[PDB]
A = this chain, B = another copy of it.
Amino acid sequence: NPYFAAGGGLMILGTGLAVARSGIIKAS
């Protein structure tokens, strides 16, 4: 679990990257 609790964090920050790219593109 703790060695593989980072996959969820990378998925979370990747969803954040997609929301930021989408929202960032809308702002631009």
A binding-site residues for B, Cβ under 8 Å: 1, 3-8, 10-11, 14
Contacts and interface: CB of A to CB of B under 8 A. Distances in A.
- Copies of this protein, total: 2
A10 B11 CA distance: 10
B6 A6 contact: no
Contacts of A6: 1, 4-5
A14 to B, nearest CB: 7
Contacts of A5: 1, 6, 10
Contacts of A11: 14
14 contacts: A1-B3, A1-B5, A1-B6, A3-B4, A4-B4, A4-B6, A4-B7, A5-B6, A5-B10, A7-B7, A7-B10, A8-B10, A8-B14, A11-B14
